Amino acid sequence: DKHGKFLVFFGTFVDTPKLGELRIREKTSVGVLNGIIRFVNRNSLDPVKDCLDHDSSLSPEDVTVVDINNSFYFPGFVDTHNHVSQYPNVGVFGNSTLLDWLEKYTFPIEAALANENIAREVYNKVISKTLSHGTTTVAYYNTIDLKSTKLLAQLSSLLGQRVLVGKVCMDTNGPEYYIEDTKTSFESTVKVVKYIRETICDPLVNPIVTPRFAPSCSRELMQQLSKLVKDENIHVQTHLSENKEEIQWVQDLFPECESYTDVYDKYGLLTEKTVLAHCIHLTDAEARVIKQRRCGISHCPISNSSLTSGECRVRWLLDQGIKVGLGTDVSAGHSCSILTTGRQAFAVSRHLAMRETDHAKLSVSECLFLATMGGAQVLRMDETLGTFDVGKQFDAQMIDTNAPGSNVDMFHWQLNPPLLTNEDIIAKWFFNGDDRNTTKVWVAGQQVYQI
Amino acid sequence: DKHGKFLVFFGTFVDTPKLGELRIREKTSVGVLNGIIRFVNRNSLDPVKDCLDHDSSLSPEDVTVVDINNSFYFPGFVDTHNHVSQYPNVGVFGNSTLLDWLEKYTFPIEAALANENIAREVYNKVISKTLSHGTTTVAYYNTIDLKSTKLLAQLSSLLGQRVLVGKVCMDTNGPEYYIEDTKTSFESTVKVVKYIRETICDPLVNPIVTPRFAPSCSRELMQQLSKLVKDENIHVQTHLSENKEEIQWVQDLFPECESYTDVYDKYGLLTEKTVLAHCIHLTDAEARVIKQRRCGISHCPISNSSLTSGECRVRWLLDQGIKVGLGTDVSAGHSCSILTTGRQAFAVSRHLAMRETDHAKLSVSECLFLATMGGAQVLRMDETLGTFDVGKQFDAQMIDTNAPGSNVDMFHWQLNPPLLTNEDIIAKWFFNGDDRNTTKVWVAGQQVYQI
Ligand SMILES: O=c1[nH]c(=O)c2nc[nH]c2[nH]1
Ligand SMILES: O=c1[nH]c(=O)c2nc[nH]c2[nH]1
Ligand SMILES: [Zn+2]
Ligand SMILES: [Zn+2]
């Protein structure tokens, strides 16, 4: 417990304050107190003194120095879309696309998690594992089950991860064994919001209203949830425009609306704090509504490729001023790692570019931005998360490119044969790094994970 | 050294004898003697006796049992295309596409490896690292340097990996600091072939004639190499139809030919043992020539995506009877892992499918096939490699899905909540496995790697 203890981290700090830039600050001291960054001084020669200089009420005994060659601090990753409840099925989907995959794998496993023993095991695994890949903040879709969603929020609080925890709402078009009625779906959402806000009462743990997607939610349910969302100022997360059959289904189910996006817009679910997952097949008009309502987009490339859903036009969305983050979308996406997700966003943008132009391509720096600040923007937490800056939360991971077992190698003579830049080193971690390189993770200035 | 020692491996054996099938043999004994599989008996109750039954000249003392829950044997991966010399640059390529990437990164690093100290370090790293990812057989492009190519072949022999080692030939369109003249390029190829065949004299180490690609090789050089290849019955490897600017360049450079493929065909380099890397933008006519000449194709998805080269139409090539393997294509591809390569081949086939049909999609089983047998077919070694079958080489890796640090998790209750098949377990390793799950590697019935 670091609360009340003035921390100063010294070393190399890497982050992405603006899309496309990679800020590398060597020999830098970052002061952290009660989870908040108090100063960032480049070329610190005296980290303790940097603290004493910052606050004269401090003495050397009040300061804890943390000493970071091959190693840097990077912001915690933000996973804007993760069905923790589906984790048992990562890698398991065969040749299926979305709607068959829902029927065959997802409703079965989500229902199975009504058993608290299974859920508790799954939740502990996924929180620990995403932490070990550097994910400090995650928006979790759970299941329709109230009790298990509360437990997920409890264990999130316990383990120190920053989360939004959603009870999934489904009152239409689900199997009888895995469906709610409208009143239950709404009221259990009210309860879960209350329990998280008033009982869990933890700044790291937030509720999020989770209409599964338009085919699963009646007009009445969506309007009720929308009123809850407006009155209680709650985040929202749902899927949008992922798969063409899904899109056709939505059109068939809501012919009074202009588009899938218009369904959510008309029944009140598009807000500054709505996280829209996938958003592949959007029309220009749909993207314009999303912009006007200031919703954020969770880009889930692994899922989109594995389910043959399509290619998210990330550049096209960014070019319109829509904020974009990354989501693992477990389990449609097999990986718990936003780093892995980032690498695939990089690849997906190039499949697009092969037919569009180079413009569609995302750089390493941009994907890392999406993996951190982008997600914070989507969650509307970018004033407090995503970069090493004064006032922001110390959500951070230590990256050691020479941690044991690392696939990120560098030869001494790279650091007149060609030499690596600092940017190159970051790119080697981006492409070949994994959890083994994330050796420590901090959330809110607390260490929550140690390799 | 296991030579002269009758080995029997007992456990679960997974392999892909035919495209699309995943053969899982539990409680199976595989007898291995002097690198060759002698029997495969499903439901072995007595592995020692299975050996005594196989060969009455044996006694219990002559038999060494190797005992494999979460673990199976899988064939060693085949990397049909790897520029070991470019390894220092994995992850390093920025926004570049092929021709800029050659100029900016590849010729510089390849030239740098004329320094034997650097090369020795690189070769030891890459052989050890590809072994640790389960790559038992690899076709290596080195550099134009004779001495370093010999060393690569020496260290390959020393470390136990099965390799084809190519001295790169370039006598045109290269920078003055990294080019050969025609006579040197040919004669150093003759020498390297001789040195490998007659001095290294190791069944695991083979030469391979390596014209870099058509723009780098004069008509005279190609014809000389073609005659060498015919007279000495040597493998060939080159790049084909990777990047549209490259393709235009070839057309401009060889306007007397009908196509890029026709350049290699006319000057004699298309043979049953020619490994053609990439082969993205082939016309129907080009693919037909490749079929008629019985060349194999190295599919290098990571490179193809990272350099925005395009999407290899793997299904379309397979549908024509052309054999396809996987290649990492270090360093245009950042990964040394054919497993990683396989996962990306899986993804690339789905980007294709999004616009073609489901037909273009590769299953998990098919990618694993490409990763093993496919590569063996491309190298024309599939009678002796790629599967656990009698007469074939014991090129094999032990996969432990619960090795330390594994990202392949399974809950006990997955092995009435939904249960995993054996195929599902393999798919979880396919999508979330990495080198940490490859705990032992055997080449030619010798253990060459231990985690
Ligand atoms: O990627 C997704 N995962 C899901 O569980 C889901 N449900 C509806 N739509 C969905 N998309
Ligand atoms: O993927 C590739 N890597 C290379 O070094 C190369 N050279 C020519 N063409 C090439 N393609
Ligand atoms: Zn989802
Ligand atoms: Zn290559």
Curated annotation (Swiss-Prot), chains A, B:
UniProt gene name: GUD1
Cofactor(s) the record lists: Zn(2+)
Domain of life, per lineage: Eukaryota
Pathway(s) the chain acts in: Purine metabolism; guanine degradation; xanthine from guanine: step 1/1
Reaction it catalyzes: guanine + H2O + H(+) = xanthine + NH4(+)
One GO cellular component, as annotated: cytoplasm
Listed name of the protein: Probable guanine deaminase
Binding residues for Zn(2+): H81, H83, H239, D329
Single annotated GO MF: guanine deaminase activity
Function: Catalyzes the hydrolytic deamination of guanine, producing xanthine and ammonia.
Keywords, in A-Z order: Cytoplasm, Hydrolase, Metal-binding, Zinc
GO BP, one annotated term: guanine metabolic process
Miscellaneous notes: Present with 279 molecules/cell in log phase SD medium.
Keyword Thylakoid set for record: no
Enzyme class: hydrolase
Keyword Chloroplast tagged: no
Family per similarity comment: Belongs to the metallo-dependent hydrolases superfamily. ATZ/TRZ family.
Residues annotated to bind substrate: H83, V84, S85, Q86, R212, F213, H239, L240, S241, E242, D329
Localization of this protein: Cytoplasm
Catalytic activity, EC: 3.5.4.3
Comment on bound cofactor: Binds 1 zinc ion per subunit.
